[PDB]
Enzyme design. Structure first.
Site, PDB file in Angstrom:
ATOM      1  N   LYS A 211       0.857  -1.188   0.000  1.00  0.00           N
ATOM      2  CA  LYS A 211       0.000   0.000   0.000  1.00  0.00           C
ATOM      3  C   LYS A 211       0.896   1.241   0.000  1.00  0.00           C
ATOM      4  CE  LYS A 211      -4.026   1.977   1.024  1.00  0.00           C
ATOM      5  NZ  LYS A 211      -3.259   2.617  -0.136  1.00  0.00           N
TER       6      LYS A 211
ATOM      7  N   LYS B 125      -1.558  -4.461  -9.436  1.00  0.00           N
ATOM      8  CA  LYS B 125      -1.278  -3.130  -8.916  1.00  0.00           C
ATOM      9  C   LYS B 125      -2.285  -2.140  -9.490  1.00  0.00           C
ATOM     10  CE  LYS B 125       2.165   0.492  -8.825  1.00  0.00           C
ATOM     11  NZ  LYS B 125       3.491   0.941  -9.276  1.00  0.00           N
TER      12      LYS B 125
ATOM     13  N   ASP C 296      13.746   4.586  -7.385  1.00  0.00           N
ATOM     14  CA  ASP C 296      13.106   4.144  -6.160  1.00  0.00           C
ATOM     15  C   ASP C 296      13.614   2.797  -5.626  1.00  0.00           C
ATOM     16  OD1 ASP C 296      11.072   4.790  -4.180  1.00  0.00           O
ATOM     17  OD2 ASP C 296       9.853   3.200  -5.073  1.00  0.00           O
TER      18      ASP C 296
END
Ligand SMILES: CNC(=O)c1cnc(N)c2cc(-c3ccc(S(=O)(=O)NC(C)(C)C)cc3)sc12
Length: 286
Positions: A15, A40, A130
């Site tokens: 989440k 997703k 990321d």
């Protein structure tokens, strides 16, 4: 494609403020003989967010590599990305829960696979932006994969960097200095992040040893809110850095420190990184 009606929800896998990955069963014949998949979807669909999601899906679709999560398809009504379901989940959770089964040699095997997965991206001029053990997935004992490309950007032809400042929260404690101060993202900033990933692995995800915990202590837990980045920038400018994880070999920590160079051009390539790690692996084998 995958039909909405045939995807059964089983459980939530991840989440965020603008995303979610759920574990689903795609049972088109509704005879419990379908495979389990990871889906997703945007937590709060916004046209801006939907546009990026569209590009993300194209990014993943253009990737095919043993160390990159496999794209299975899309699901239209609220766009949904259908990926393969890696049974052992994130490297972060896996490692934390099974630290007794994973030794340093294995950490270096994972490390090497991540490098090959990143070298592959760089070959397509893709900047991940990321990387963190929470988005590296575990297919099995011996195989890990980069499992999320939600912030991945493509470098423009004429520049070796990309500038971007997305609204909301960023994983600052994994960001290179120039990304914090100049919003610049490049292969070199991915390498800085890689070194934080290496750090993570060797801390075995001990809660008090996480990058956020370690930096906040250095900066001072009595810190503000908007001033957190400011101080983080200063700390890295004066060469302040994450400590050597307990039991971490000096030669591994130096790989981390070299990845954490303020001089963007002085950071090692993913290819050389794979090379040094595999060398160390062998030196530990025989
Ligand atoms: C037990 N098995 C699993 O759990 C599992 C199985 N198969 C998968 N393909 C995945 C993918 C995962 C994942 C988890 C967080 C993030 S993230 O980078 O933080 N992005 C958000 C949270 C916004 C979605 C990306 C991907 S887990 C998982």
């Amino acid at each position: 494609q995958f039909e909405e009606r045939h995807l059964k929800f089983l459980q939530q896998l991840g989440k965020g403020n603008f995303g979610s990955v759920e574990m689903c069963r795609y049972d088109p014949l509704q005879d419990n003989t379908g495979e389990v998949v990871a889906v997703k979807k945007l937590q709060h669909s916004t046209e801006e967010h939907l546009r990026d999601f569209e590009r993300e899906i194209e990014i993943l679709k253009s990737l095919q590599h043993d160390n990159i999560v496999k794209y299975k398809g899309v699901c239209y009504s609220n766009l949904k990305l259908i990926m393969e379901y890696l049974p052992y989940g994130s490297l972060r959770d896996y490692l934390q829960k099974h630290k007794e089964r994973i030794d340093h040699i294995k950490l270096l095997q994972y490390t090497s696979q991540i490098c090959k997965g990143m070298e592959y991206l760089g070959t397509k001029r893709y900047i991940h932006r990321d990387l963190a053990t929470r988005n590296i997935l575990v297919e099995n004992e011996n195989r890990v994969k980069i499992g999320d490309f939600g912030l991945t950007k493509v470098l423009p032809q004429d520049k070796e960097y990309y500038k971007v400042k997305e609204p909301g929260e960023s994983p600052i404690f994994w960001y290179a200095p120039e990304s914090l101060t100049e919003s610049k993202f490049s292969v070199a900033s991915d390498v800085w992040s890689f070194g934080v990933v290496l750090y993570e692995l060797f801390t075995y995800i001990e809660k008090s040893k996480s990058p956020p915990a370690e930096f906040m202590r250095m900066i001072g837990n009595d810190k503000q809110g908007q001033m957190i980045v400011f101080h983080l920038i200063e700390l890295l400018k004066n060469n302040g850095r994450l400590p050597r994880p307990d039991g971490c070999p000096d030669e591994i920590y130096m790989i981390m420190t070299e990845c954490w160079n303020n001089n963007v051009n002085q950071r090692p390539s993913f290819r050389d990184l794979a090379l040094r790690v595999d060398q160390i692996r062998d030196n530990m084998a025989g």
